[PDB]
Amino acid sequence: VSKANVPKIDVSPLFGDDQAAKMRVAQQIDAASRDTGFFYAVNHGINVQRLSQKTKEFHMSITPEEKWDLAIRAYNKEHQDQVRAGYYLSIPGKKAVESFCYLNPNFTPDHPRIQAKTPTHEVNVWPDETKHPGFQDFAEQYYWDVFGLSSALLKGYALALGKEENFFARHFKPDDTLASVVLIRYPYLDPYPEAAIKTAADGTKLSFEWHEDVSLITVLYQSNVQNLQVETAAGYQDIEADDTGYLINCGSYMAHLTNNYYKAPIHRVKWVNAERQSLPFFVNLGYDSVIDPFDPREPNGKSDREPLSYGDYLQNGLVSLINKNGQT
Ligand SMILES: C[S@](=O)C[C@H](C(=O)O)N1C(=O)[C@@H](NC(=O)CCC[C@H](N)C(=O)O)[C@H]1S
Ligand SMILES: [Fe+2]
Numbered sequence: 293v294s295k296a297n298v299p300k301i302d303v304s305p306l307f308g309d310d311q312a313a314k315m316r317v318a319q320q321i322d323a324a325s326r327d328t329g330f331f332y333a334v335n336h337g338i339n340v341q342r343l344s345q346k347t348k349e350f351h352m353s354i355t356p357e358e359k360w361d362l363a364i365r366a367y368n369k370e371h372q373d374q375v376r377a378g379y380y381l382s383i384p385g386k387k388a389v390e391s392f393c394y395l396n397p398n399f400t401p402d403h404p405r406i407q408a409k410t411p412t413h414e415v416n417v418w419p420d421e422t423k424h425p426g427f428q429d430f431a432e433q434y435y436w437d438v439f440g441l442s443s444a445l446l447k448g449y450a451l452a453l454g455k456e457e458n459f460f461a462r463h464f465k466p467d468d469t470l471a472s473v474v475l476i477r478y479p480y481l482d483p484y485p486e487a488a489i490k491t492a493a494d495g496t497k498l499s500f501e502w503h504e505d506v507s508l509i510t511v512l513y514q515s516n517v518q519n520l521q522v523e524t525a526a527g528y529q530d531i532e533a534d535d536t537g538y539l540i541n542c543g544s545y546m547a548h549l550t551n552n553y554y555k556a557p558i559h560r561v562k563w564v565n566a567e568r569q570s571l572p573f574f575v576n577l578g579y580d581s582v583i584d585p586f587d588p589r590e591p592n593g594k595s596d597r598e599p600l601s602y603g604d605y606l607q608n609g610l611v612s613l614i615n616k617n618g619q620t
Contacts (some may be wrong), residue, residue, distance in 0.1 A: 296522050296529035297327050300537065304335040306444035309477045311417035318451035325542060328529070329557030333511075336441050339512050346430045347569055350392070351477045354379075354419060362392070362417050366619050371524050376472065376610070380396045380620055387620060388488040389499065391476040396469055398434045405468070411607050414472055415576060435473055438573040441509050445540060446575070449509065450490070453550065453588055460508065463581040463602070470606055471499075474565040480567040489563050490605035494528070496521070497563035503508075506609035507543030508575040513531065514539065515568040523558040531559075545575070545605055551587035551595040578582065579603035 301320045301553040305313035324331035362379035365371050365395050370376065382390040394416045399406055405413040418428045450459035462473075478499065483489075484550040490498040502523065514520075516535040531539070547556040561570075577583075614620075 293521075294526060294529050296325075296330065296524065296531050298328060298330045298531055298539075299324055300332045300534070301443060302335045302336045302450065303333045303441075304337070304411075306448050307337070307433060308465060311420055314447070314457070315451055317610035318421075318448050321445075321448045325554040329555055330522055330531055330539060330541050332496055332534050333540050334537045335443065338437050338538070343434055343571065344515065346427065346434075346537070346570055347444070347475050347571060350419075350427050350475065351569075353424065353509060358419050358423070359390075362419065363479075364393075373414060373415065375414065376412065378417045379517075380409065380535055385485045386487045388481060388485065389476060389478055391474050391620065393474050394435070396466075397435055398467055402444055405579065410510045410551050410603075412579065412603060412610075416505075426537075431475075433474070434468075435471075438511055439464075439469070439471065439475070441538065441574045442471070442509070442573060445509060445511065449546075449554075453554075458528070460577075460583070463577040463583065464575065465578060470579060470602065472574050472576065475574050475575075476570040476572075477575045478564070478566070478568045480533060482563060484565050492560070496528070498560055499563045500561040500620075502558050502560040503580040503613060503617055504547070504558055505541065505543035505574070506545075506613055508539050509575045510539075510543055510544045511573040511575060512539040512541075513569070513571040515570075517564055517566045518566050519560060519562045521560050523560075528560070544609065545577075545600075545602065548597060548600060548605075549583050549585050551585060551589075551597060558564075576589060577602040578605055590613060 305317050315388040325604045361380050362375045367381050377393050377395050380391045399413055399415055434479045446460040447457040450457050469494040492498055518533045520531040522531055540556045542556050544556040546554050581602040582599050584599055585592045585595040
């Protein structure tokens with residue numbers, strides 16, 4: 293299988309005030325977005341080793357009792373309000389992956405969207421502090437650290453598209469973003485259950501089938517175990533692992549907004565019998581954010597797509613994905 297072109301882009305100018313340097317970053321983002329659709333963000337400023345250590349400590353110490361107590365509705369009918377946030381359980385013998393999802397820490401019981409019980413907004417659930425000292429605080433701070441990186445990246449994408457740098461970022465705000473963190477555990481298992489292994493039409497053993505992301509962009513930390521593949525005209529290609537960088541790609545909202553100038557790349561997860569982490573941040577806008585679709589290939593910038601609200605986009609997409617590839 294050939295290796296995918298995934299360049300490493302030094303994104304540090306996007307945090308500063310050197311506008312020319314920022315355009316040179318934007319060109320690299322443009323190039324990667326028009327090629328395979330992936331790049332690694334390097335010099336991003338985030339302590340990923342500490343993220344992976346705190347995440348390991350949580351995954352390896354949470355107990356079965358705690359998983360039920362935090363479980364989303366799909367696993368625990370008592371928890372009707374938890375569609376998105378909480379624990380996603382494994383099924384020994386059938387489903388290997390397990391994960392924990394949390395949303396904007398500002399979605400508190402007094403937040404006006406929580407009061408209105410607006411879809412896709414939830415108050416996060418957390419384990420007991422004494423059993424997981426430091427974990428909630430760590431995870432909440434991680435949310436804001438990756439939010440800051442994501443805001444810088446959105447400035448780069450906006451420049452790359454010929455827009456002013458706050459074109460996306462002005463819709464990405466601490467008080468209302470629908471962005472989520474997922475702390476995914478892919479375990480080592482001996483024997484590994486065949487029912488937990490899917491098989492692609494080409495024969496490749498998979499843990500998660502082909503999909504486009506439900507996001508504006510995805511900002512991903514993973515361990516140094518190769519597993520991702522991207523579909524290109526060349527066929528599926530392997531994305532090399534880099535546990536020092538953030539793997540970045542566009543989701544299908546970006547594809548809508550840009551009339552597919554920046555495609556949401558189709559990708560999938562190969563089956564690997566290895567204990568590893570996958571820690572995506574899904575960059576979602578606010579529930580009522582609307583960006584007028586455009587097309588940077590057309591002289592007048594005009595597109596024949598209708599405007600779509602982020603909240604409608606997100607609620608439909610999350611359901612569709614579960615229907616396509618199954619409840620994670
Ligand atoms: C790089 S790979 O595609 C990332 C990863 C994986 O399996 O490692 N994936 C997931 O997990 C899949 N994504 C989802 O199921 C969407 C989760 C959305 C989330 N529960 C939310 O409420 O925001 C996909 S995006
Ligand atoms: Fe994905």
